[PDB]
Amino acid sequence: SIRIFPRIAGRSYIIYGQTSGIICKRMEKSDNEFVIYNYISEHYDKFLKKYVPKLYGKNNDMLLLEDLTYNYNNPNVMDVKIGARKRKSHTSGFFSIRGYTNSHDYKFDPDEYLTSESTINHIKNFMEAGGENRDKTKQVLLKWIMKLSELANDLFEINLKFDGVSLIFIYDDDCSKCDVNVVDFSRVKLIDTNDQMTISAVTNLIKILSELADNP
Ligand SMILES: Nc1ncnc2c1ncn2[C@@H]1O[C@H](COP(=O)(O)OP(=O)(O)NP(=O)(O)O)[C@@H](O)[C@H]1O
Numbered sequence: 001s002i003r004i005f006p007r008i009a010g011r012s013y014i015i016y017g018q019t020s021g022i023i024c025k026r027m028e029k030s031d032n033e034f035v036i037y038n039y040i041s042e043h044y045d046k047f048l049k050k051y052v053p054k055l056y057g058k059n060n061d062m063l064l065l066e067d068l069t070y071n072y073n074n075p076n077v078m079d080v081k082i083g084a085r086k087r088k089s090h091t092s093g094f095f096s097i098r099g100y101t102n103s104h105d106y107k108f109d110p111d112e113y114l115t116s117e118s119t120i121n122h123i124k125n126f127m128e129a130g131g132e133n134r135d136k137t138k139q140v141l142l143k144w145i146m147k148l149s150e151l152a153n154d155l156f157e158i159n160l161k162f163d164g165v166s167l168i169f170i171y172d173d174d175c176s177k178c179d180v181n182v183v184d185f186s187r188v189k190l191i192d193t194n195d196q197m198t199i200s201a202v203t204n205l206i207k208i209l210s211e212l213a214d215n216p
Pocket of ligand 1: 006
């Protein structure tokens with residue numbers, strides 16, 4: 001009938017598609033997420049190809065989207081808001097961890113403002129549930145760093161304010177493959193410059209992840 005999707009964060013009605021590899025996200029407030037997908041498609045298709053989950057189509061108010069967790073045996077997922085919050089400063093300065101797999105088990109609260117110490121430990125907690133193998137964690141961090149690097153670089157040439165967008169970090173329990181993608185275009189806007197706020201979010205995450213990958 002209807003299988004509801006294991007969101008890691010956010011408020012939206014998201015369900016498994018009737019078919020493999022798809023989730024349906026309801027647009028609650030407006031069709032702005034759909035208008036923005038189609039804008040990015042026409043003006044920046046390379047950005048869409050590399051970083052954004054595929055939009056397969058629309059069914060009334062629902063978006064048929066690529067399930068990012070589909071190709072994984074045991075996904076571990078972390079949602080980090082890197083674009084500006086509606087009102088409210090970021091819980092970790094330049095970004096906000098909205099949640100992660102097993103966050104309850106480390107008494108993570110999305111409203112708690114965090115020192116640089118807490119922030120790092122919460123990312124380390126995210127890495128624990130697979131991790132263990134010291135240098136499968138390095139390979140996961142380094143592959144995330146590789147992609148966020150290209151993303152931070154590519155953002156300089158993109159005239160959008162990425163208000164409210166998130167990074168979805170995934171890795172498998174048996175620390176093989178991993179990925180990070182940009183999601184949630186519902187409050188994204190056109191502007192005549194780049195988004196220095198969102199760039200600082202990504203560069204800061206790159207800094208934090210590099211520190212963990214170098215850590216002995
Ligand atoms: N393409 C995707 N593949 C897999 N999981 C996804 C995908 N898109 C969204 N999610 C999951 O859904 C959660 C929230 O959906 P998101 O697209 O961020 O918007 P939202 O629900 O409108 N949030 P908000 O209005 O700020 O409360 C994420 O934290 C992920 O766990």
